[PDB]
Every structure is written in C-alpha cells, then in structure tokens.
C-alpha cells in the first residue's frame, strides 16, 4: 500500500488499549519494566475443530512472536517434521509460528506486518489462518494454501 511516511511506529499503550475490544482474554500483563506485552486466550478455527491457546509477545524493534501453548502439537503431529516453524523460544514452551514475510525479503521496504497496524486486527486472524491450514495439512499429507518460494541457498533468517 502506498502510504504516507508521516505516521510513526507507535508505543505500548495504544495496542494495550486496543486488545480489550475483541474476544475473551484470560490475562493481559505488561512486564520487563513497561516493555513486553503479553496476551493469551481461547481461539477456535471453525465450528467442529479443536480448542487452542495462543500466546502473543511484543517488543519495539522486534517482530511479534506467536506460539501455541496448549496442545503440545507434536503428539498430534505424529512425530514427523512440521514445516513453517522458526527457531523456538527459550523462555516459554511450545511451537513458534510464522505469520509474515519480513523486511529483508520485501522489495518495497514495507513488510507484511507493519508497526503502523495494531496487533488484534491482523496477527490473531493470521494465527487462526495458520491453524485453519494446520489441521488440513492432515488427511492429505500436503500444505495446500499459501506457500514459500523454493529458495536454493537462502535460509530466510
């Protein structure tokens, strides 16, 4: 999107007030001396699918981290390798999820996640969109949907 550059990256408080307008939340803390936002809740993809718990951590200058905490995802993965995963976190357990093409792979300079957009509009429908392709990875053995480029050498990190 051709947008103006007058809008700046916005602080903790504006997405602190924005997360309470949508959905049921268990707790929403602020830790590490007014640095790190934390959200967890119950997210369901469809009417007949499972029950999921996601976890959102944000710091300025860093991309946000989505990680599914319950269930463990490796027992229902069936001990085969799950693609579209980042290297995992050392502080909270679970499988980390990918949601965006970052800044270094884009050509216009604007990433798929931007700092102008708030948190609850985009990344939790993208987490539900990751989970809606996660259980249709099963019953066919393929990842039908969005896919990455077949890069010969690049690690995307």
């Amino acid at each position: 999107v051709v947008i103006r550059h007058h809008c700046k990256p916005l602080t903790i408080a504006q997405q602190y007030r924005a997360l309470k307008a949508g959905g049921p939340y268990e707790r929403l803390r602020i830790i590490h001396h007014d640095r790190t936002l934390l959200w967890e809740g119950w997210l369901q993809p469809s009417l007949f699918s499972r029950r999921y718990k996601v976890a959102v951590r944000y710091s300025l200058g860093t991309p946000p981290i989505c990680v599914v905490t319950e269930p463990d995802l490796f027992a229902l993965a069936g001990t085969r390798a799950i693609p579209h995963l980042y290297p995992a976190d050392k502080h909270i357990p679970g499988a980390r999820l990918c949601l965006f093409l970052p800044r270094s792979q884009a050509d216009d300079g604007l990433s798929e996640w931007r700092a102008q957009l708030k948190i609850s509009d985009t990344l939790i429908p993208w987490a539900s969109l990751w989970l809606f392709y996660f259980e249709q990875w099963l019953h066919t053995g393929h990842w039908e949907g969005g896919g990455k480029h077949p890069r010969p050498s690049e690690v995307k990190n």
């Binding site: 959905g23 369901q44 579209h84 965006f100 609850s120 939790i124 969109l129 990751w130 249709q136 969005g146």
Partner: protein, 373 residues
C-alpha cells in the same frame, strides 16, 4: 455425544453436507432431455409396427425417474431408467406374442441390435457408458373400480402379475408437495430424505459380508415406508426447528408403520391393496424372510449410530474422516476441495472476516492477502 443433544447449527450444517452430496450425485436436466427424446424415439418406433398387438402402444415413465429420486450407483458410471409400454390391443393376447412383438420391433432397427442386452423384467437398450433404458409390456385390467391405472405386468414366473405405478406415483406427488410446520428460531424434502438413505445404503454394503449383500433392503420398500411416515407427521401438526429431526423421526416410525397382519407382512398400495411390495419380505424358503427383517433393522440401527459418530468427532480432520465412511472416498474429496477454493478466493476478494468473540473465521474486516511466509 448424541445427535439430538446437539445445537441446531451443527445439525443443519451436517444436513447441508448431506444435501450437497445428494445434489452432486443425482441426474442433471440436460441428460433428462436426452433420455426423454431417446425413449420417445423408442415409443415412435413401436407405434409404426405392422403387428395389430403393437398398435396404440404408448410409453410413460415409472420408477425413480418419475419421483425424481435417482442416485448414481456405487462403482457404476451409468444410470438406470425404467419404463412401461401399455398396449390396449394386447389385452386379448398372451405374453409370448407381446414379448416376440416388442423383440421384433426393436429387432428391425440395427442400432438397437448393437446396443442391446436382455433382462428378465424386459428388454434393456443399454448405451455406451451414459445410461440404460428398460421397458415392460403390460395390458389393462378390466372389472375393477380404482382411482387410477388398472394394469397387469409381465413376470417371468407366474406370467401375469399386477402393479399400479401412476396412482402410487401421484400419491407420492401429492404427499411430497406438502411442507410441514417450522418453529421460530431466535426437489422437495421427502424427495431428498429418501435419497440420502439410499446413499447411506451403498457404503453400508462396503463392510458387510456376502449373505447381507443379497439381503440389503430393496429400494422401493424404503420408498413407500417414509411416505407412510410423512402422512402421520402432517396429520399430527407438529413443528420442527431442524431438518435432521425430519430424517431421524421418519426413520424412527419406519419400523412401526410396516404392518404385519394375519402373519403376512403387508406394505401395500393405497389405491390397489391386492399386490404386495413386501412379498419379497414374506417368503420363507431357507428362512430368508427373517433374514431381510434382521438386515433391515441392522441398517436401521447403523443409520442412527453413525449419526452419533459425526457428533462425537472434534477436529476438522476427523469430520472428513467420519464422512469418508458415510459417502465413500471419492465424493467427499470434491466437497472438501470446493471448500478451500472458496477460502483461497476469500483472501483475494477480502470476503473472509473473523469475529473475535466467537473466534471462528467465516467465509462468505478484510484479512490481508499472502499470509503464509
């Protein structure tokens, strides 16, 4: 988990999947026009016969093609149509003269020689991988007072049995147009609930043994019993919020409305009570009559038990695992592949929204495109 303790949204979503499978698996109207022009061509080739028994021969349809309850069979590319030719000058004649007359009248045409295989209820003009045509020669019955259609048919055993197709069909076409009462929520219905019970019957025969493969229930004794169960629901004037409890209550009254009287099972016609549609049920050589009363009720138990297995599944991968065993492997894959070519089109068009309180994505607040990597 039972299918009556579910909410209405999951129940009518299951019934929408069943009606989507039946609307896939039926016969389309362009093929109906080709079948209609084809059998009217067979009827005009009968009407130019030089034999006097063949004169004034007219063909009207019968079976499932009159009631719009035709379903593509299991492992079969080709449908089946059945017809009756009525001959008023063959009332004096015997069945061998009319069988040789219809056989010579389709022996005159050479494409009807190269497209023919015989069958005991009548001659079958099968085609190359599209459909079949059947016919049945019949007289008229004289000396009885009826609301409609007095007729005998040709049977291979007793040489003239009886039927009454069009009054029974107009009894179905008068009961089918009546819609029941619906509560206030804060192709007809009887034509569709016959058809999903026929589709459940083919995948029921994929697991049963070879003695129950002969003893699977025949399709016209399922047709007349749900017509009996639909007349009682209209006469009771009850109301229904859902469209799956019109399938479950009709299957519940399905064993109570088959009436055995003086030791012989009678599922008759309302217009002509002489001939028995459950005469196949009634014969007791090698205890076969108890075998088709046992194997109808085993299918009656397993068409309620598998409706609790769809309600017991969690996960969308296990919804299509359970519905694979209801419809076969192939037709659930067409409905599933349509469901995320609509969902991949919803990301580009922006129609996909997500309410945060319910949590679930709804595909008809726009999500950005190209989310994965």
């Amino acid at each position: 988990t039972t299918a009556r303790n579910l909410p209405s949204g999951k129940k009518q979503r299951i019934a929408d999947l069943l009606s989507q499978i039946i609307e896939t698996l039926d016969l389309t109207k362009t093929q109906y026009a080709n079948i209609e022009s084809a059998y009217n061509g067979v009827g005009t080739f009968l009407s130019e016969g030089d034999d006097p028994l063949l004169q004034d021969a007219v063909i009207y349809p019968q079976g499932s093609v009159r009631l719009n309850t035709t379903v593509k069979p299991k492992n079969e590319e080709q449908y089946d149509i059945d017809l009756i030719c009525y001959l008023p000058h063959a009332t004096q004649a015997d069945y061998t003269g009319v069988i040789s007359a219809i056989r010579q009248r389709l022996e005159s045409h050479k494409t009807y020689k190269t497209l023919l295989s015989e069958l005991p209820r009548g001659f079958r003009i099968n085609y190359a991988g599209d459909y079949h045509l059947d016919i049945t020669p019949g007289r008229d019955h004289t000396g009885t007072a009826h609301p409609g259609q007095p007729l005998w048919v040709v049977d291979a055993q007793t040489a003239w049995k009886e039927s009454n197709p069009s009054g029974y069909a107009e009894w179905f076409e008068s009961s089918a147009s009546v819609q029941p009462l619906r509560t206030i929520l804060v192709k007809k219905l009887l034509n569709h609930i016959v058809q999903i019970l026929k589709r459940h019957r083919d995948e029921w025969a994929a697991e049963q043994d070879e003695v129950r493969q002969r003893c699977r229930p025949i399709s016209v004794i399922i047709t007349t019993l749900a017509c009996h169960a639909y007349n009682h629901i209209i006469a009771d004037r009850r109301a229904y919020d859902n469209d799956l409890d019109i399938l479950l209550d009709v299957l519940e009254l399905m064993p109570d409305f088959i009436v055995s009287t003086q030791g012989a099972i009678h599922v008759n016609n309302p217009h002509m009570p002489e001939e028995n549609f459950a005469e196949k049920w009634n014969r007791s050589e090698q205890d076969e009559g108890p075998q088709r009363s046992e194997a109808f009720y085993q299918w009656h138990a397993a068409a309620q038990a598998t409706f609790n297995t769809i309600a017991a599944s969690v996960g969308e991968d296990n919804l299509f695992l359970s519905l694979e065993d209801s419809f076969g492997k192939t037709p659930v894959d067409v409905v599933r592949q349509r469901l995320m070519e609509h969902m991949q089109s919803a990301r580009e068009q922006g129609s996909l929204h997500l309410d945060k309180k319910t949590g679930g994505l709804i595909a008809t607040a726009g999500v950005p495109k190209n989310t994965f990597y």
